[PDB]
Amino acid sequence: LISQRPTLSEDVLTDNRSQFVIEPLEPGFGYTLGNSLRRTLLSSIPGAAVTSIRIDGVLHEFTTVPGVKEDVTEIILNLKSLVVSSEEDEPVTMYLRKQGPGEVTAGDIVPPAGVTVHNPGMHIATLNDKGKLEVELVVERGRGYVPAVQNRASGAEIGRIPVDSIYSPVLKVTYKVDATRVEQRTDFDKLILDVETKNSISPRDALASAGKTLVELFGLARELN
Template sequence: MNKNKKSVSIKTPELKCVEFRVESDRFNYGRFTLSPLRKGQANTIGSAIRRVLLGEIEGTCITRAKFHNISNEYSAIIGIEESIHEILMNLKEIVLQSDAYGIREGSIYVVGPKEVTAGDIILPPSVRIIDTTQHIASINKPIILDISLQIEKGRGYIIQNPGYIIQNANNSNYKDEFFPIDAAFAPVQNVNYSIHSYWSENETQEILFLEIWTNGALAPKEALYEASRNLIDFFLPFLNANEENRYGLPISCTPTANEENRYGLPISCTPTDTKGIDFNQMYIDQLNFSTRIYNCLKKANINTVSDLLNYSGEDLMKIKHLGKQSVKEILELIRNIGIDSPGNTV
């Protein structure tokens, strides 16, 4: 064993966007680097983030369409070049963006002759079309194309039941039924990662290169942020496994009962010294806030406990959608884990 070998400390890894291109409304490209990393870390991070980018990022799609007075998906409408099936396939490709969950309603009502595009879709305020030029149908006669649409936000892929149409084929009211459309919610089209190893300070270090292609509903950097958030959420149960140190803080507990308060801390816990804790490295994800409170804080760009401590109760009340009761919950949690913040009252 070489006693003279120096211990090596790697700097905190830094993420950089080294290239970003918008080749069209529906084609965004981003290339990122993360370094320095220890040997093996780049593959661990690259593999995990790639899986989440491809399978866990939410998107918005048209999932059902109703053609008024049409009884069969494979019908043809005189005066329209495309069959119903072809129009459904075109609707499937429409790229949308939405912050709203649940089913949203849209519609198309046009009079020909006309080239029908995504820009002709009438949408609620919560939904936006990324590329209004996407083709839907070509009407070459003075007829009306009337379509009702259902729009949903989700993740992954949904393959609709192909037997749906057959099961309803004998239904006299079928003309008023929605045709299901296969949904590909994922806004991330492709992800590649590669690793470059190099020798530095007597140790092998690595650089992770990450390439992300999206359909324009999210920029690559936004998709990477969402994927990182999802990964953090996946691992929170492991961070919370130790009830006596749920928040990563030294807490001196002498429980007299098994009862816990709503933050998971034994009622008899008395918070102790928090010196030495780097609140810049402690994220609000670890504080077990409700989804609504968490989202409000994130929108206010409060990411770490250090950010949160800069806000008094009065400041928190000014954050949009954060009510007095929510502010009380935030301040109560801060007090329960032994941290004091400016104006820790409401």
């Protein structure tokens, strides 16, 4: 029977990968905590992403552009892989303008303030001499995986192609515990939890936000009294 209190440490293994040790847990309480945190981080972390874009030349996802070796649909597929940290809830925009040949990446996009393209080196499209790519995009906050909204549901403009919404700064989480189990029963569990985030914020920051939510949820549990 241990009368001590749990702790939580930090061990940053890479830029966006971190470890967190909690000691001591309770006999059998090991897994469930990391289990719950896995769900919360993966599903309950408010992020931001590009939602709907616009291209001066094209009116839908099913027309190519004169000059690009890539295609509009695969352009959306590429841009689905953006790592951009907005800071404000309201729609923010960007611009990608490039003419003449040259591999255009996610660094050539010109952002206004408040949006940090965490991936400036990720390729976007390939243009040629006739290549002329001038794309508008809108970024916005939220959480979870909001599907692509309908450009008609809102009284919106045709060039606006609604893209899916992925507000998830979490790459992968993995927990583990190690029961002590001495016959004398002075036993406790120790949670070696691991977080790996999507390069948009710190794993620590996402963990803090998940705890921010879960303290609310558990405060509801104590709220009966």
